[PDB]
PDB file of C-alpha atoms in Angstrom:
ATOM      1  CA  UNK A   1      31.983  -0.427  27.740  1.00 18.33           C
ATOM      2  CA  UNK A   2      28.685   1.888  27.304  1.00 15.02           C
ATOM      3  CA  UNK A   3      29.177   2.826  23.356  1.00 17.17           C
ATOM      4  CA  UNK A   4      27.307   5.263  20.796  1.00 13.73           C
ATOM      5  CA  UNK A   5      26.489   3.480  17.947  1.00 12.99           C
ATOM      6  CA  UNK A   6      26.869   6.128  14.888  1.00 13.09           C
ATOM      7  CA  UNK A   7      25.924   3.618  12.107  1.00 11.80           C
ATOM      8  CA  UNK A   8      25.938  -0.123  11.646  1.00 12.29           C
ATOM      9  CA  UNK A   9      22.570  -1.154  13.495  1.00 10.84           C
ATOM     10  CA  UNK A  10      18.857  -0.671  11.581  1.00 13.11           C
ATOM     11  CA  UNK A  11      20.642   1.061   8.940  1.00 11.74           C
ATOM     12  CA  UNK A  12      21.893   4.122  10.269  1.00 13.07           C
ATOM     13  CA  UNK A  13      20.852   3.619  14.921  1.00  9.83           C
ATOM     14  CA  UNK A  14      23.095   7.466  14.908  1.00  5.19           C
ATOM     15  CA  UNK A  15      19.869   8.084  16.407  1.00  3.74           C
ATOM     16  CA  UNK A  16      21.360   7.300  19.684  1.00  4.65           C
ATOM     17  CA  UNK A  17      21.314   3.118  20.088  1.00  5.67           C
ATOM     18  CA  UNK A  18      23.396   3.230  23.213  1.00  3.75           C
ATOM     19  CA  UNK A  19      24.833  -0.290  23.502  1.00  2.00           C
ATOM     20  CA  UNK A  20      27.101  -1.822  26.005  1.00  5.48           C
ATOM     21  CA  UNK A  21      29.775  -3.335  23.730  1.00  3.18           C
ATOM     22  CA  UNK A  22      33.031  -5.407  25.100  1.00  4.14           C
ATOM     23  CA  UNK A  23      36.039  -2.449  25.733  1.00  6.64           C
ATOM     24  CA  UNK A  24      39.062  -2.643  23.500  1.00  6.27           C
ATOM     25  CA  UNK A  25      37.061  -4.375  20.793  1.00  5.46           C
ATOM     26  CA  UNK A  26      34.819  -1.625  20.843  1.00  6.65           C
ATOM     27  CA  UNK A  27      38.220   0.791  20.327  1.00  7.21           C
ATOM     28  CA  UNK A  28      39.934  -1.561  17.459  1.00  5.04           C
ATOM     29  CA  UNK A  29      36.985  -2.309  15.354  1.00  5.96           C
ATOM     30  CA  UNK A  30      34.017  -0.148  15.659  1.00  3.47           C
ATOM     31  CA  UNK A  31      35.752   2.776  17.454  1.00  3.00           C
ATOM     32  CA  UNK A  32      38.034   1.627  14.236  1.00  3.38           C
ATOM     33  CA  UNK A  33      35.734   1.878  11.458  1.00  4.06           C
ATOM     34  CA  UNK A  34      33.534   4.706  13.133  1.00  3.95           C
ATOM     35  CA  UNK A  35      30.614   2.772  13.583  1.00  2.00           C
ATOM     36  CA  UNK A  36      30.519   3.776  17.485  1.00  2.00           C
ATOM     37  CA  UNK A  37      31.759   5.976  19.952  1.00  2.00           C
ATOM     38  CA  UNK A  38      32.660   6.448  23.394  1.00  2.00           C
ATOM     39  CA  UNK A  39      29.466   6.732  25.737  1.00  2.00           C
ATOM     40  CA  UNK A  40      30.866   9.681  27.622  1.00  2.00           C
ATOM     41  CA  UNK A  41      28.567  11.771  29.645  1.00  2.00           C
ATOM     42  CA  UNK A  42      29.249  14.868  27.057  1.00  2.00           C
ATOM     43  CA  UNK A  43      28.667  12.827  23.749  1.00  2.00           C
ATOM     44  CA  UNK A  44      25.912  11.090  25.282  1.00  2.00           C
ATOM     45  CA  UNK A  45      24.365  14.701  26.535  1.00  2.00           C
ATOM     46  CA  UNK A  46      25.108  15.954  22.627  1.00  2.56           C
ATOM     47  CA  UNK A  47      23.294  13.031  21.426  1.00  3.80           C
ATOM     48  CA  UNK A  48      19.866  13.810  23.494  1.00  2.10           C
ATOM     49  CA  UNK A  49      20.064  17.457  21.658  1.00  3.11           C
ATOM     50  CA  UNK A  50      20.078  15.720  18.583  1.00  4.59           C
ATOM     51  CA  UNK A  51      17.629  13.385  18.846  1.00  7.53           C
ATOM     52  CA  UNK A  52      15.192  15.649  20.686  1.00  7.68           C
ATOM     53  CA  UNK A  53      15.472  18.285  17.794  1.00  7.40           C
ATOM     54  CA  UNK A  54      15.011  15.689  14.951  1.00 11.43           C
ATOM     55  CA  UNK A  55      11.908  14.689  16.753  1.00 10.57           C
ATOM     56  CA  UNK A  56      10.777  18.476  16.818  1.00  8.99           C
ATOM     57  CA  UNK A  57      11.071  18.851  13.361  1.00  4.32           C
ATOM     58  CA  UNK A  58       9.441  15.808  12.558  1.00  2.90           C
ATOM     59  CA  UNK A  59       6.749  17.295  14.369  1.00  2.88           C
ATOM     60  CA  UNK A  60       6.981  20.506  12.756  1.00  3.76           C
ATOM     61  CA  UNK A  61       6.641  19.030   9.102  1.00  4.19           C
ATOM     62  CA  UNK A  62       3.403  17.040   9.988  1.00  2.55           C
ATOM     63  CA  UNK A  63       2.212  20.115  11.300  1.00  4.07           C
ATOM     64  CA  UNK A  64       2.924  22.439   8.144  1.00  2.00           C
ATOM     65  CA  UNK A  65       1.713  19.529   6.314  1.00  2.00           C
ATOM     66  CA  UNK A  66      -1.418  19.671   8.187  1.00  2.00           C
ATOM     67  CA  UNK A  67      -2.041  23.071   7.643  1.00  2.00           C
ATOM     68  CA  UNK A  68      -1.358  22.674   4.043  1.00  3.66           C
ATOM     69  CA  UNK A  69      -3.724  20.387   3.539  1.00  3.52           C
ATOM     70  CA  UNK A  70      -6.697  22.614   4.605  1.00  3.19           C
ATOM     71  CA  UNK A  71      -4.979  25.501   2.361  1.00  5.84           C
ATOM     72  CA  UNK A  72      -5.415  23.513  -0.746  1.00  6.12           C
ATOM     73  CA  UNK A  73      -8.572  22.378  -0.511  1.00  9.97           C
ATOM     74  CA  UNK A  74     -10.078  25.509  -0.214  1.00  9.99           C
ATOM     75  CA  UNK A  75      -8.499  25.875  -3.988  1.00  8.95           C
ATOM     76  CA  UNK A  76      -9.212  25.512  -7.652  1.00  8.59           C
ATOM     77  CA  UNK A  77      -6.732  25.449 -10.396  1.00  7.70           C
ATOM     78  CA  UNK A  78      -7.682  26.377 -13.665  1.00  7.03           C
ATOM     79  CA  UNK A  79      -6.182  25.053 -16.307  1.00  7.23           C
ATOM     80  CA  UNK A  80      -7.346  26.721 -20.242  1.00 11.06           C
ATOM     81  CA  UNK A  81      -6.489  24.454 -22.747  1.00  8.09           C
ATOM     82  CA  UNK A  82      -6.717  23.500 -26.155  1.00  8.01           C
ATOM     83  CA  UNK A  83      -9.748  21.071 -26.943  1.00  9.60           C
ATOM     84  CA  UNK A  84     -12.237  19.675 -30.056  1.00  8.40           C
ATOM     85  CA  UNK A  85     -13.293  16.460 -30.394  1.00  6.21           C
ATOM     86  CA  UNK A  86     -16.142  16.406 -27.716  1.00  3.57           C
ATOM     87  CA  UNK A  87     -14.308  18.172 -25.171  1.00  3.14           C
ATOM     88  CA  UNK A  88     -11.077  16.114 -25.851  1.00  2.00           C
ATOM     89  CA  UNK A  89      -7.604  17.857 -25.164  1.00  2.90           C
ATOM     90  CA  UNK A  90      -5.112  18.819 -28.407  1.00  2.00           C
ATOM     91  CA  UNK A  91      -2.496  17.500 -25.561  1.00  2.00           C
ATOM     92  CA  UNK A  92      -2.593  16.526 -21.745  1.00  2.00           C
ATOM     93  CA  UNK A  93      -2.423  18.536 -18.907  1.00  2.00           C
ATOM     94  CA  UNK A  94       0.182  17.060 -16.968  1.00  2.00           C
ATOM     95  CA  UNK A  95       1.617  17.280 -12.978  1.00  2.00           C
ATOM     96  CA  UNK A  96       3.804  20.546 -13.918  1.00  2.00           C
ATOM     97  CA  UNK A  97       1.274  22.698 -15.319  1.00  3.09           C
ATOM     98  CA  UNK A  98      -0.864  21.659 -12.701  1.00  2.00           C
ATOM     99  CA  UNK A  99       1.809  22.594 -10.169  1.00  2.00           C
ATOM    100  CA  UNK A 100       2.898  25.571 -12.103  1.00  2.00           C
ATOM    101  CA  UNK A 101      -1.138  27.342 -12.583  1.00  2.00           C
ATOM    102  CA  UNK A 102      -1.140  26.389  -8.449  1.00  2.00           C
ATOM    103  CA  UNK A 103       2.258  28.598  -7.949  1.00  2.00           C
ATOM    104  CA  UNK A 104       1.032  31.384 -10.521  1.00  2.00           C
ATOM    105  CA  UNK A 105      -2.854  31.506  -8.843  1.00  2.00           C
ATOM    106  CA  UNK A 106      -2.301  30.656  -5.508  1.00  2.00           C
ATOM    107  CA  UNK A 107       1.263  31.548  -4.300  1.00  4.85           C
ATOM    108  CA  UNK A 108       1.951  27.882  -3.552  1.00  3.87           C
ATOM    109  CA  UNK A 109       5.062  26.604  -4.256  1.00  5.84           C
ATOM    110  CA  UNK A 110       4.411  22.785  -4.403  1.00  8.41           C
ATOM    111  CA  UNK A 111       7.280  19.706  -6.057  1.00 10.09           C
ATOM    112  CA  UNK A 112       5.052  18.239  -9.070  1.00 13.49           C
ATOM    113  CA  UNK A 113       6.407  14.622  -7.262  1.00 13.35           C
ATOM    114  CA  UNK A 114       3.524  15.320  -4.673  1.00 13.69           C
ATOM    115  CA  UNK A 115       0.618  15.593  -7.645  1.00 13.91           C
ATOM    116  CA  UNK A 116      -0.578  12.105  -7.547  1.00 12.08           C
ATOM    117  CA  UNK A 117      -1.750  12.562 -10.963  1.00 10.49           C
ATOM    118  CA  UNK A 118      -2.171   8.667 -12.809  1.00  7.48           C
ATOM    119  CA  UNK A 119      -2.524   9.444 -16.410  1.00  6.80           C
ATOM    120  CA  UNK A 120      -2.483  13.018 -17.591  1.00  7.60           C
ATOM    121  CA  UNK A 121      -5.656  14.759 -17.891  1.00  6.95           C
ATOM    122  CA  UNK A 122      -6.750  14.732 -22.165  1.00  4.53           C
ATOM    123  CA  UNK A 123     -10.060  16.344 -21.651  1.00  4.30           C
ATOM    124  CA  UNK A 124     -12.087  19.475 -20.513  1.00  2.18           C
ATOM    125  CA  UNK A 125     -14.012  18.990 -17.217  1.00  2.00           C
ATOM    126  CA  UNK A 126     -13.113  18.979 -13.416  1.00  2.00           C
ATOM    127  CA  UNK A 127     -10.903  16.381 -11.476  1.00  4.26           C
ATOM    128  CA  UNK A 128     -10.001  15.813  -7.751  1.00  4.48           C
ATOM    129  CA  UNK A 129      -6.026  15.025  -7.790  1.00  5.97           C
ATOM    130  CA  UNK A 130      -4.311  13.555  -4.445  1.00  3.62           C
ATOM    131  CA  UNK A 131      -1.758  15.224  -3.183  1.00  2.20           C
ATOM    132  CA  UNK A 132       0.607  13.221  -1.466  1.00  2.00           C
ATOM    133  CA  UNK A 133       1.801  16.208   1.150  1.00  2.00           C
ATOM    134  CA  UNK A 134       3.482  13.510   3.499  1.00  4.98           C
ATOM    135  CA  UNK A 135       3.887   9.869   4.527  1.00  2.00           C
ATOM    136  CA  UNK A 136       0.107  10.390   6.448  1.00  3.90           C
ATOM    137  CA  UNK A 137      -0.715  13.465   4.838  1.00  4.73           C
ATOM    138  CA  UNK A 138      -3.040  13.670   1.554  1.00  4.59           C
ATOM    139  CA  UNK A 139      -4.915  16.318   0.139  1.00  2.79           C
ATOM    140  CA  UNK A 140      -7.332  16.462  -2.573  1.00  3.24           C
ATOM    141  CA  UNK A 141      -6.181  19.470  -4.935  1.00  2.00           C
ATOM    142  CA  UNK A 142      -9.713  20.396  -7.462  1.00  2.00           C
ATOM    143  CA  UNK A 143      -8.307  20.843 -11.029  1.00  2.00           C
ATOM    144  CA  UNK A 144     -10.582  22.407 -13.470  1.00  2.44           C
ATOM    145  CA  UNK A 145      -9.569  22.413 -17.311  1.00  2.24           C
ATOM    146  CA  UNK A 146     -11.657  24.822 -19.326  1.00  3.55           C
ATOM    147  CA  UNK A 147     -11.057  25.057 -23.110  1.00  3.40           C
ATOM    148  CA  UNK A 148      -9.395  27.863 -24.479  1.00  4.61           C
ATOM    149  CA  UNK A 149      -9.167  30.367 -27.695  1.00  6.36           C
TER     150      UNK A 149
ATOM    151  CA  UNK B   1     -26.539  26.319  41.543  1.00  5.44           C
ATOM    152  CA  UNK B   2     -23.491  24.488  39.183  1.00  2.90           C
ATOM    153  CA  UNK B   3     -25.825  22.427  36.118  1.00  2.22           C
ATOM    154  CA  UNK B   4     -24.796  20.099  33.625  1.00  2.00           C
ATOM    155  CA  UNK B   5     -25.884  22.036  30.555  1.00  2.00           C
ATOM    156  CA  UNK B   6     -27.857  19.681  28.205  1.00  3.69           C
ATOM    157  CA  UNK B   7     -28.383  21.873  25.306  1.00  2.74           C
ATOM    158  CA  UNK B   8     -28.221  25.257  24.597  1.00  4.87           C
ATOM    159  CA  UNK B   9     -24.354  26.159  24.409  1.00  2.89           C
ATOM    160  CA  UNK B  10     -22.258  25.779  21.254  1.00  2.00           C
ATOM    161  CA  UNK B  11     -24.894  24.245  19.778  1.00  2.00           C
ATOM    162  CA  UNK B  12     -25.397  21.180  22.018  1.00  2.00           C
ATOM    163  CA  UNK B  13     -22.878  21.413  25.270  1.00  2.00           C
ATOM    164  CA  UNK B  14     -24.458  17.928  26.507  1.00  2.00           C
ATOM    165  CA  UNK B  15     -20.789  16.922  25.954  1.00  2.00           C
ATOM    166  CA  UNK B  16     -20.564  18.805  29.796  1.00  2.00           C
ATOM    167  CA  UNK B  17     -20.654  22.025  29.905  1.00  2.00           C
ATOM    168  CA  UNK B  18     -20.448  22.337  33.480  1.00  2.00           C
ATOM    169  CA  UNK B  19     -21.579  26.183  34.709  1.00  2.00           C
ATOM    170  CA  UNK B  20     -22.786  27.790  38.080  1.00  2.00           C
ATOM    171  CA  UNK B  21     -26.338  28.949  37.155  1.00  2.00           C
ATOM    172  CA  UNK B  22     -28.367  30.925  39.330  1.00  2.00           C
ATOM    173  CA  UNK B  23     -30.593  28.290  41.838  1.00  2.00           C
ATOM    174  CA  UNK B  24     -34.494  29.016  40.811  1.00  2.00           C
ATOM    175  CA  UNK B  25     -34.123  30.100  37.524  1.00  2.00           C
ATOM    176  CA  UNK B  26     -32.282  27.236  36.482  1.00  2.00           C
ATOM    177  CA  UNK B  27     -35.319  25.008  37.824  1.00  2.00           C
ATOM    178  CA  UNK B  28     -37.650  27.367  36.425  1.00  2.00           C
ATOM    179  CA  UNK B  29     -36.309  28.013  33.069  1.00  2.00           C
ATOM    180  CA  UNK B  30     -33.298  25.690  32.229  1.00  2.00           C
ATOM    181  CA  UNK B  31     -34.330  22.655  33.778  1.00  2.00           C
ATOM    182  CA  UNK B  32     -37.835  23.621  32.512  1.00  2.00           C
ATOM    183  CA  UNK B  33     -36.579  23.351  29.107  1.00  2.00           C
ATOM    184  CA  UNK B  34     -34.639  20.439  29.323  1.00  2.00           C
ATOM    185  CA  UNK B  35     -31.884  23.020  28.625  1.00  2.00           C
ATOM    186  CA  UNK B  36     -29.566  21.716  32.188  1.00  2.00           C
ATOM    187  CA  UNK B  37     -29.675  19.052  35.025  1.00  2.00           C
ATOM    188  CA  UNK B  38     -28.488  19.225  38.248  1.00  2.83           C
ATOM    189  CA  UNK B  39     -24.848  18.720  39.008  1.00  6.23           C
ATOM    190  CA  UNK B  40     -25.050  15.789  41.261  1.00  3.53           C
ATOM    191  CA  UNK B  41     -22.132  13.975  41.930  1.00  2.00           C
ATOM    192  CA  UNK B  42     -24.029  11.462  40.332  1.00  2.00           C
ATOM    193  CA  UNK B  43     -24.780  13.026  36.901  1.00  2.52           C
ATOM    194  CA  UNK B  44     -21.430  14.644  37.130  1.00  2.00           C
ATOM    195  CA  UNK B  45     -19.326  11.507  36.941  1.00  2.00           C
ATOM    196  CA  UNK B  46     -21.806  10.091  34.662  1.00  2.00           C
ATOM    197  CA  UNK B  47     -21.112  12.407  32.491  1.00  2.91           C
ATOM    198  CA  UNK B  48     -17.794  12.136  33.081  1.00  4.72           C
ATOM    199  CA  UNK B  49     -18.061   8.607  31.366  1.00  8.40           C
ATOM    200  CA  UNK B  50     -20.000   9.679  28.242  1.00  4.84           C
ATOM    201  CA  UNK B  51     -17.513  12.450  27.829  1.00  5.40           C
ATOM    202  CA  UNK B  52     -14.829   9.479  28.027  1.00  4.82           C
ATOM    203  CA  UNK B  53     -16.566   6.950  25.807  1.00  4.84           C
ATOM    204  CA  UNK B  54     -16.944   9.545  23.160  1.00  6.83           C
ATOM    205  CA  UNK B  55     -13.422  10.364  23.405  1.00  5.47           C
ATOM    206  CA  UNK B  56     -12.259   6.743  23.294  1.00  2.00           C
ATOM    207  CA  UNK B  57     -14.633   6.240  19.907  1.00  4.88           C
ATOM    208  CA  UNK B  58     -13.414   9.415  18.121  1.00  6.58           C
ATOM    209  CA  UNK B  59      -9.649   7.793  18.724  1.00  3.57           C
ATOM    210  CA  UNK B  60     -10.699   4.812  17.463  1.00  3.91           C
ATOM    211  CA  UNK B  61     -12.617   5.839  14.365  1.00  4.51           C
ATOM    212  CA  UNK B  62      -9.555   7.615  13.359  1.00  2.70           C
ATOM    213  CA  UNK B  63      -6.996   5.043  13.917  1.00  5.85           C
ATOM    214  CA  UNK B  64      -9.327   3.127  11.684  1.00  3.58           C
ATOM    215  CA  UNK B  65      -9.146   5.250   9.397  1.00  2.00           C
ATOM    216  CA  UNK B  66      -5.116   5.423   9.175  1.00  2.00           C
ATOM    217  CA  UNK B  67      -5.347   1.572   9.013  1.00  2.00           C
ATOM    218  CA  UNK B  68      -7.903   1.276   6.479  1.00  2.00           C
ATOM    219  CA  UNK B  69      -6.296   4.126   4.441  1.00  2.00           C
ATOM    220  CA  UNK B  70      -2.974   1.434   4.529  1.00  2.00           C
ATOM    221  CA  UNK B  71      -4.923  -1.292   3.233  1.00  2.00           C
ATOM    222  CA  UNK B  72      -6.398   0.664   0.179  1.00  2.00           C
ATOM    223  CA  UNK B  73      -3.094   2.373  -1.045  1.00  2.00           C
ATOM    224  CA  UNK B  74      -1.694  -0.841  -1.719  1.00  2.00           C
ATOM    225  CA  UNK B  75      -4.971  -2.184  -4.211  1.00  2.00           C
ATOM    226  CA  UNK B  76      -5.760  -1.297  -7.486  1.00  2.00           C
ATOM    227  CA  UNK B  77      -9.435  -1.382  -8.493  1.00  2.00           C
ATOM    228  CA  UNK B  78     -10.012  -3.098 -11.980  1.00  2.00           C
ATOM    229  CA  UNK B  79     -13.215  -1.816 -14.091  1.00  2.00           C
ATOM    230  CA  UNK B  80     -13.564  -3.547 -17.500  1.00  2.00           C
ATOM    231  CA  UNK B  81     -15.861  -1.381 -19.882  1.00  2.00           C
ATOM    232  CA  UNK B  82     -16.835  -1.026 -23.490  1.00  2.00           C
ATOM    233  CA  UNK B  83     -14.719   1.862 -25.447  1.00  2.00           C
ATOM    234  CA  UNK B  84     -14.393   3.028 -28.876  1.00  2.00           C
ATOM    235  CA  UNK B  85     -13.781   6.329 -30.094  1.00  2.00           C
ATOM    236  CA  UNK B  86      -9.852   6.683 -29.298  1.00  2.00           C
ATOM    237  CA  UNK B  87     -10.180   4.761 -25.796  1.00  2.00           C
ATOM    238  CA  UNK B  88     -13.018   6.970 -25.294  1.00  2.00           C
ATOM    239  CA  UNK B  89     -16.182   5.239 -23.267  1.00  2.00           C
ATOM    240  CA  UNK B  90     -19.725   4.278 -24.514  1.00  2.00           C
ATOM    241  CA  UNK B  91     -20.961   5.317 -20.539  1.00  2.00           C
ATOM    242  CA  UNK B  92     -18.852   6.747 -17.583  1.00  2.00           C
ATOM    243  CA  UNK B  93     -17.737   4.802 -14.629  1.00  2.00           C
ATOM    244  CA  UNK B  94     -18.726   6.808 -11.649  1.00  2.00           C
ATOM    245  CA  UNK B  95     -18.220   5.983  -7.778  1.00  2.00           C
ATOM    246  CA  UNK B  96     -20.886   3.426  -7.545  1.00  2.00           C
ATOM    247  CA  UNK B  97     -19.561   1.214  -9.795  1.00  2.00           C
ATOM    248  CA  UNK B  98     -15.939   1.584  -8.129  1.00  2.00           C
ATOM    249  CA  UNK B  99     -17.665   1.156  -5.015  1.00  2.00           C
ATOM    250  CA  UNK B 100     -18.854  -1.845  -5.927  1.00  2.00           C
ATOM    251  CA  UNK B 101     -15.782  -3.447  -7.603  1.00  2.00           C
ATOM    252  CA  UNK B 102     -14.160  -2.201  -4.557  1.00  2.00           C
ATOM    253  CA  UNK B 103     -16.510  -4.499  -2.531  1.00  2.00           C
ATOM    254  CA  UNK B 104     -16.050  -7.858  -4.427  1.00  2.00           C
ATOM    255  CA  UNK B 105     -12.562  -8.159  -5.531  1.00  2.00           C
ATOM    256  CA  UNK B 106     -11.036  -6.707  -2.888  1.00  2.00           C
ATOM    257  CA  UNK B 107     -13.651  -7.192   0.470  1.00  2.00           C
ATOM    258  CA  UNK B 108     -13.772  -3.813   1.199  1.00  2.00           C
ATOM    259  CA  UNK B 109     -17.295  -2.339   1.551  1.00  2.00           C
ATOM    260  CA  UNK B 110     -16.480   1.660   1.563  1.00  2.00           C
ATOM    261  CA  UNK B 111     -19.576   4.350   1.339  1.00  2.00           C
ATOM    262  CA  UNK B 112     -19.346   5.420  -2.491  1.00  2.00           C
ATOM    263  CA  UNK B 113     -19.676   9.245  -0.596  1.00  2.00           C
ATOM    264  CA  UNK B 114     -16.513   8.753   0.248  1.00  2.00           C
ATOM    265  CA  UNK B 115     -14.631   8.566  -2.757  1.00  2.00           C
ATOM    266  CA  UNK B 116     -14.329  11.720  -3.959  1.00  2.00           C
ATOM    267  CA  UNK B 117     -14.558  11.063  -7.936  1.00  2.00           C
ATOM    268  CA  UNK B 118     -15.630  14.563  -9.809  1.00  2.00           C
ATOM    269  CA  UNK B 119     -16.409  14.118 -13.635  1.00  2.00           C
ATOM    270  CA  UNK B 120     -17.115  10.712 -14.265  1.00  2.00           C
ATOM    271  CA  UNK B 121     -14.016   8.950 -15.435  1.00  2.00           C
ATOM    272  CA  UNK B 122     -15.271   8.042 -19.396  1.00  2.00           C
ATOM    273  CA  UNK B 123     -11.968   6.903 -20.703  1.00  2.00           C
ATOM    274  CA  UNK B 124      -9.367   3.761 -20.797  1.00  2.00           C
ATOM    275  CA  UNK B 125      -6.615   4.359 -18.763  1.00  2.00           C
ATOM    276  CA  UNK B 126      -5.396   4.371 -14.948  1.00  2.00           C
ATOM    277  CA  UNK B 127      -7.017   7.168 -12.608  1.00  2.00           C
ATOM    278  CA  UNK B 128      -5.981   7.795  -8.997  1.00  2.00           C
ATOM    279  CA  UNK B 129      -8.977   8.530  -6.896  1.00  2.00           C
ATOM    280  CA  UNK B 130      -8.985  10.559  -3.422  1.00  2.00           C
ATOM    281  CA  UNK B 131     -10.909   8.648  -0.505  1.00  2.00           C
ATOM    282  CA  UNK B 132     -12.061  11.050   2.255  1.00  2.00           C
ATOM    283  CA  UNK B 133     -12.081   8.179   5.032  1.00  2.00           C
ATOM    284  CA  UNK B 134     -11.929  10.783   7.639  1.00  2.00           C
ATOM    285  CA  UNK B 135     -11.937  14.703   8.528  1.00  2.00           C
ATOM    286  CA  UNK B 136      -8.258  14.134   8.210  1.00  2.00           C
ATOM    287  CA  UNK B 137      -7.572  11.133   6.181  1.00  2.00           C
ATOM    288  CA  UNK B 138      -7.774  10.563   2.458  1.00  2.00           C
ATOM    289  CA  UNK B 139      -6.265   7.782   0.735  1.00  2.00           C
ATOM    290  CA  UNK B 140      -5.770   7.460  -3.027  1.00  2.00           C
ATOM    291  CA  UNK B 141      -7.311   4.911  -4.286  1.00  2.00           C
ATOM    292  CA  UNK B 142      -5.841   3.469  -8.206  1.00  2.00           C
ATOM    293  CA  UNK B 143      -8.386   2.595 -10.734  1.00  2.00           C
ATOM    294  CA  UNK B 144      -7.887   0.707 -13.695  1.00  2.00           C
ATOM    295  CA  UNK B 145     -11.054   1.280 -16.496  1.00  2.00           C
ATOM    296  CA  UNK B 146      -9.772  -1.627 -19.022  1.00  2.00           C
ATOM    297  CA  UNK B 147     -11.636  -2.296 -22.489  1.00  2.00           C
ATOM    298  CA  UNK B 148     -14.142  -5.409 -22.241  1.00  2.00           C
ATOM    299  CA  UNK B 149     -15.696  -7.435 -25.111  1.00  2.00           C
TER     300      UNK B 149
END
């Protein structure tokens, strides 16, 4: 019996693994603990929809990321801050201000969790941050402190 | 007359810009020039392979790229250097010297244009670095300035 595995496989193969499994077996265990489901020509139909739209997002995101990419490095935060000794920083600039000066000067909207940043920035200058935009998508975001008061 | 242009389109069209130029003045100006050639069956599909060989390369170069972005993003470079003042450097490491340590403890010989450092990093600490391996692939790469002596 043709089954539609909905979970136990690689983790979660509700992608669509389409198995052959043994018939009544199939209906007192996995049909049982809804791991699979009955290959019929409708849920089988329903699954192909599914599949072939996550794989259009998928291709969306990697698109927008794409374009986001070029976006950013066009950019320049500027960050004023508080600084003495030599140029060195009263505190640090850190992966929120960084995001937040990017939403208030450039009408991006961007999670800090994608501003690479190591250890937070504790002097005036200019530093390239990665931007980690998705799984093959990385941007380098130009962050320039410049002392303030 | 169809010619191969040679030169003289978008810049250089030798990639085959094939176009239907009128017979005479195209061997009395173009191919005077060096500008077209003579579309020839011959020099038609032989173009035909250059215009396949460069497309083969370009793929290649960039899956390179992707790989050689995998290996980097899982290193950590480690420069040792005399501090003082509050962590605070006597120099500044700069993209040479990560270059370098790049090269010998980890094999990797990368162009030092490549790693797209801004202010010279000239304090203790861990610093993520962006790596423009391609037109569309950067990698971050981790440094690690520790205090010697």
């Amino acid at each position: 019996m043709k089954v539609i595995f909905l979970k136990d496989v690689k983790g979660k193969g509700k992608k669509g693994e389409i198995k052959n499994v043994a018939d009544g077996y199939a209906n007192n265990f996995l049909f049982k603990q809804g791991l699979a489901i009955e290959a019929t020509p409708a849920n089988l139909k329903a699954l192909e929809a599914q599949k072939q739209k996550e794989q259009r997002q998928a291709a969306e995101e990697l698109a927008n990321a794409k374009k986001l990419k070029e976006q950013l490095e066009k950019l320049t935060v500027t960050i004023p801050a508080k600084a003495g000794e030599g140029g060195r920083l009263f505190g640090s600039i850190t992966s929120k201000q960084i995001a937040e000066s990017l939403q208030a000067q450039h009408g991006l909207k961007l999670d800090k969790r994608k501003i690479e940043l190591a250890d937070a920035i504790r002097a005036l200058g200019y530093t390239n941050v990665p931007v980690k935009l998705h799984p093959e998508v990385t941007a380098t975001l130009k962050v320039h402190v410049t002392e303030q008061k």
